[PDB]
C-alpha cells in the first residue's frame, strides 16, 4: 500500500499497540489507551520513568 | 416483563468497551461502546 498509505514526512495515523500486560485472546480487540508499567513501580497520572 | 436486558464487560465504567443488551417495548437493541453506564441503569413506561 506504498501508493496510498505513505506520506513523505510519515503517515503517523496508523497506530499499533506496543505495550500491555498479557497477550490478547483470539479475535479480541483492545481499545485501552492507559499507561503501561514496565518497571516494578506502580505508575499513575500521565507519564513515568 | 420486569427483566429487560443485561450489561456485560470488563470495567463497566467508560474507561474501556462494554456490551449493552436490551429488549425495549419495540425491539431488541444490542450495542458495544465505551459506555458510561448509569449507576442504577433501568427502563420504564406510561400505562393505559
Ligand atoms: C480481560 O480483563 C481482565 C481484567 O481486566 C484481565 O485480567 C487481569 O489481568 C491483569 C494482568 O495479568 C491482572 O493484574 C488482573 O488482576 C486481571 N484481572 C482479572 C479480573 O482477570 C484479562 O487478562 C483480560 N483478558 C484478555 C484476553 O485481555
Swiss-Prot record, chain B:
Glycans are attached at residue 24. It comes from the Viruses. Binds to host ACE2. RBD also interacts with the N-linked glycan on 'Asn-90' of ACE2. Cleavage of S generates a polybasic C-terminal sequence on S1 that binds to host Neuropilin-1 (NRP1) and Neuropilin-2 (NRP2) receptors. Interacts with host integrin alpha-5/beta-1 (ITGA5:ITGB1) and with ACE2 in complex with integrin alpha-5/beta-1 (ITGA5:ITGB1). May interact via cytoplasmic c-terminus with M protein. May interact (via N-terminus) with host bilirubin and biliverdin, thereby preventing antibody binding to the SARS-CoV-2 spike NTD via an allosteric mechanism. Attaches the virion to the cell membrane by interacting with host receptor, initiating the infection. The major receptor is host ACE2. When S2/S2' has been cleaved, binding to the receptor triggers direct fusion at the cell membrane. When S2/S2' has not been cleaved, binding to the receptor results in internalization of the virus by endocytosis using host TFRC and GRM2 and leading to fusion of the virion membrane with the host endosomal membrane. Alternatively, may use NRP1/NRP2 and integrin as entry receptors. This is Spike protein S1. It comes from Severe acute respiratory syndrome coronavirus 2 (2019-nCoV). The gene is S.
Amino acid at each position: 500500500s506504498n501508493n496510498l498509505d505513505s506520506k513523505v514526512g510519515g503517515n503517523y495515523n496508523y497506530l499499533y499497540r506496543l505495550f500491555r500486560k498479557s497477550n490478547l485472546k483470539p479475535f479480541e480487540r483492545d481499545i485501552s489507551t492507559e499507561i503501561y508499567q514496565a518497571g516494578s513501580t506502580p505508575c499513575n497520572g500521565v507519564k513515568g520513568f | 416483563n420486569i427483566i429487560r436486558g443485561w450489561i456485560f464487560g470488563t470495567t463497566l465504567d467508560s474507561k474501556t468497551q462494554s456490551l449493552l443488551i436490551v429488549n425495549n417495548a419495540t425491539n431488541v437493541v444490542i450495542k458495544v461502546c465505551e459506555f458510561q453506564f448509569c449507576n442504577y441503569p433501568f427502563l420504564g413506561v406510561y400505562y393505559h
